[PDB]
């Protein structure tokens with residue numbers, strides 16, 4: 001059978017994580033999905049880089065996981081018909097589709113929760129590394145999906161919709177989105193990145209922690225991401 005690496009980019013969301021772990025373990029257990037949660041704890045001081053943290057988690061995870069779930073820690077599925085299944089040959093399986101997501105509704109939205117076969121993630125050279133702070137990293141990945149001759153599939157015949165498919169417990173004031181721009185960030189991050197990815201994300205895993213949360217095993221990666229300010233100075237706008 002198949003195994004999912006549940007990759008959870010993470011910084012300063014302990015409260016969310018305590019809700020995430022039990023909810024997801026139970027949910028996935030009901031649909032027979034074998035999996036393991038990898039908390040991608042960014043311990044450098046640069047702005048949050050979700051995509052790069054995913055690259056790291058993918059490298060770390062062993063070949064026994066034949067697919068991954070890039071999974072926001074604050075987004076809980078409320079509908080058991082959302083199948084976190086091995087994606088088809090077509091490409092990524094997007095769980096949090098534009099018609100089910102509480103907040104994002106455009107056609108090619110692939111954020112929130114996105115499942116990708118190991119082989120396809122390698123094909124696409126994983127995600128761009130140039131996204132420091134909120135926004136755009138998932139859209140650039142959409143393009144990587146089309147450029148690889150792949151496509152996005154989403155669950156069919158979900159009866160629930162944008163108000164009752166997911167719990168998105170994320171108060172915009174409690175957890176601020178880091179929308180700042182500095183240096184030439186707008187211009188540069190809006191353009192397709194053919195130069196970086198899985199194969200050159202620069203980092204170190206300082207420490208690996210085996211945690212149990214009410215018996216449920218979970219792996220913490222303390223990831224010190226590196227920034228080349230000659231290429232991506234917007235990693236830090238202070």
Ligand SMILES: O=c1ccn([C@@H]2O[C@H](COP(=O)(O)OP(=O)(O)O)[C@@H](O)[C@H]2O)c(=O)[nH]1
Pocket residue numbers: 008009010011012013048050071072073074075111112134170177
């Ligand atoms: O400072 C941060 C920023 C985000 N994240 C993680 O990145 C995900 C995506 O971030 P965000 O909630 O801001 O995305 P959005 O709600 O806009 O889809 C979060 O849910 C967390 O898993 C985090 O751990 N710390």
Ligand SMILES: O[C@@H]1[C@@H](O)[C@H](O[C@@H]2CO[C@@H](O)[C@H](O)[C@H]2O)OC[C@H]1O
Pocket residue numbers: 104106109111112134135136137138139
């Ligand atoms: O990273 C993603 C953002 O880049 C995205 O922003 C949207 C992009 O398409 C535009 O038509 C919209 O103005 C804008 O909402 O939102 C979702 C996020 O995950």
Ligand SMILES: [Mn+2]
Pocket residue numbers: 072074168170
């Ligand atoms: Mn959120």
